[PDB]
Amino acid sequence: KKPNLLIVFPDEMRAHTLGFMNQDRSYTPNLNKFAKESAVLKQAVSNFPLATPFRGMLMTGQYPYRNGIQGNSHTAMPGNFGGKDFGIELKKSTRTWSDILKDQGYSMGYIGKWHLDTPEAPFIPSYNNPMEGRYWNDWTAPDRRHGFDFWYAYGTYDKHLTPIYWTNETPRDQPIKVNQWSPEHEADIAIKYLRNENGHYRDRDKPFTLVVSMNPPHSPYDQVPQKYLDKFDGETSRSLNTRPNVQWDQEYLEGYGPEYFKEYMAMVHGVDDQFGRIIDELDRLGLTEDTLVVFFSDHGCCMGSNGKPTKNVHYEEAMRIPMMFRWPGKLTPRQDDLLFSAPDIYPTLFGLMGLEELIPDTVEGTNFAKTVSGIEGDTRPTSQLYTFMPYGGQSYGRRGVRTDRYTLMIDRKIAKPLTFVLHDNQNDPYQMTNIANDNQELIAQLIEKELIPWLELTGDPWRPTEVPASVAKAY
Amino acid sequence: KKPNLLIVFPDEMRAHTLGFMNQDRSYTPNLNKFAKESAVLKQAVSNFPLATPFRGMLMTGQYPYRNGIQGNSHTAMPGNFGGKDFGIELKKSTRTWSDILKDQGYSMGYIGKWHLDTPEAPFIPSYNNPMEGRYWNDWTAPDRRHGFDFWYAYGTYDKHLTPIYWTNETPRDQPIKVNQWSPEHEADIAIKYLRNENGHYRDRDKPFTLVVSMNPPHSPYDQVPQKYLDKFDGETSRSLNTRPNVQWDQEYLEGYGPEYFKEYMAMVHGVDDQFGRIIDELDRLGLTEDTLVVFFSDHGCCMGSNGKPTKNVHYEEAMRIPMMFRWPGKLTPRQDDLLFSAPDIYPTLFGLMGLEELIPDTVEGTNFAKTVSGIEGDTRPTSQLYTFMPYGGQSYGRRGVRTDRYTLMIDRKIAKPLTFVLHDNQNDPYQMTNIANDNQELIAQLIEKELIPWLELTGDPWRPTEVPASVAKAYT
Ligand SMILES: [Ca+2]
Ligand SMILES: [Ca+2]
């Protein structure tokens, strides 16, 4: 009766990698089939396209300004700065949707990358503890798992072929060290959770929520199984990465950029294979009709498009994420260009499951269960907020809006003119031209109709005005 | 049957000015009598002791970080910075307690100083439009009055003897220009609201909320009726301002500081008189038992105590505010030392009125209606948050905690060691000594047990750590 919830989301998988989207030269047969059984939001975005900010929005239904999860949740070495110096973490006292489902009588499981805690001293052994001025990895202590009674997760760790996990059984100092591609290992654990063979993964009498947060197709690109690379045998990153806005002649940081596109596509194929294993097991078990399945990613990846290596930019390749909802017998398959945003996920899931009344007032996103279900009545957004927040600078950085036609981005520094970037996504679908100059009137309307209303709705203090050097005098 | 709500609050009146407190040498007979009939919260504070931040907390029950009302709501001149550059204003889409009460079927009236909107161009004529690089005054348009269907109010305007107001009947370009001390004029309007002769002010069949927001004893100090000054004939500012921590030889901005203490006491006395007039009319009309009456202020005023002229500091004279609830037949008179905070006002009032189920999840303050009613069982706070937020610097500035014994304040700047100020308020009642250096372990305990939990509760990203100069390179 009470519905189950299965959430699968890989990391850094742009919507363009979905084969049925007719964009990237990719091979995702399992997700293609899933899409034709699902209600697909084809215009969904990650408003702050960065892992930790997105997970903040997923767990809280709030935008970054009020949830405080405004960057990476890392911890500085002495003389440096990191997320911990600005409260960037999911707080123990925060009531997430996973807390609420737990109190509704659910068994709750989380598999994979958590990426929401700041590491604490003494820091655990880890190749990234420290790395580039910061400590990055730690377990999640049991009192910080927000209702997930089954745990099989880590903080941040990118060695895809040798992942490490903490579980109900592990103490902090002895995690499970795995020799297996992490998506496959995570699919294996998901299968066992779904089967619940010994009865100790979850309660037989309760509904369940399982989250599987895969790391690939996130970098690095040298930890991909040969099996999945073999799917693109004979092709190269050049022959595969054909998007017109790719800048091959830009200089990229070692290990990143369009020359790794073949590896990216192979990881996408690999994740598609493992997603298929999980869904096939769900259906083999007879759980298809009682389980709402949702697939998305935390942000996209530019892979050289417009000269950007990965994410954390306003471009379509970083903002656009998959978003699909499958529930055969209760959701009719469809596609919709709803301007969906990351804080809408939480309340929309609650709406779909019949739990609208449990959405607290603190949620800033919108319940679009009606639109997903093909039912009239939602107010359709005219824009999606874009944001980049520099550490400690909530009143500065980049803000922008994405409408059904334009992407506008504004950068704000102290004592400098505002920089404007404007794309006509209709005439310029690959966002290769900035038309901000001599579009003052259109930009003014976008600011007045879209950006300011989002900023006021979220409490964000950023405003599109210059400020003199004296404003920083005080601090 | 549904209770009325009368809120009266003057500006910049520290708790120490109440005669029954046995602190300042003040004459407040009407407030002394009101106190003997009320539930009095003797330790209430304004956590961000500045006008517009307090009003933000009053209307939203949220702390400043999440409500965004983090400074003065003024508008900069070209080349300057103001509140408007950082969203510092009540947003039209924000649902306040006044919006909620309106939907419950109340008549809602606001008299006096609003001080919650940024001025818009073209800027109305006003002595402070501009003043010191910013525009300060404007009306409040009908769609921004948040359920207050009777309006008699202004934005920011300190000419206490010639105030200006907008009402339902006034366009932006012709306000009402008054020649009368603002608290007296506002008491006049409030009495007319309560009488409601011929039904012009409110619906006789609805409960009402009336807010009277007075400006005195806020500066300036040369706009006081001579009548009120005459009460202190034979005294001087020197003879009245005897607090041991007053620093007479500090350098003060022209028109501020301890030499204006007589004027300050005279305004307090004047406001007490006018408060008495409003309460007497309410009781004469037989509304006493159906009306919850609340008196507070938005912040205190140091008046030279510890060398500070006015507010926006952690000292007791700036943080401590009056706070009294009268409702004869429902609230037994009492005195309580609860560590009450400004975001608690809204939910506590809803609690007292039987409206606790209407408090939204966004409210961060706590409903202490039981404590105010003398009923045991509330979780008593162990501290009150202090905050100073520089314009555009939500991660920096001063933060602190006030407990039943200590006040700790920490100031955080980019590429600087933290500065620590600690007062033992028990042994150093006037906070004249900073004992921070000899109490490193106590400070660690206060940060861990009090400050960090408040910061996490409020979402405030400020943390007590040094950050290097490089942190600002991304946005300078
Ligand atoms: Ca990510
Ligand atoms: Ca004030």
Numbering used by the authors:
A (entry chain A): 46 to 520
B (entry chain B): 46 to 521
The authors write:
These enzymes belong to the conservative arylsulfatase family, whose members carry a Cα-formylglycine (FGly) residue generated by the oxidation of a conserved cysteine/serine residue at the active site of the enzyme and are essential for the degradation of CS/DS in various organisms, from bacteria to animals. Taken together, these results clearly show that exoPB4SF, similar to endoVB4SF, is a CS/DS 4-O-sulfatase that specifically hydrolyzes the 4-O-sulfate group at GalNAc residues.
The refined structure revealed that each endoVB4SF monomer folded into α/β topology containing 12 β-strands (β1–β12) and 10 α-helices (α1–α10) organized into two domains. In the larger N-terminal domain (residues 20–420), the major 8-stranded β-sheets (β4, β3, β5, β1, β6, β7, β2, and β8) are sandwiched by α-helices α1, α4, α5, and α6 on one side and α-helices α2, α3, and α7 on the other side, forming the catalytic domain of the enzyme as observed in other sulfatases. According to the endoVB4SF structure, the two molecules in the asymmetric unit form a dimer, primarily through interactions between the C-terminal domains.
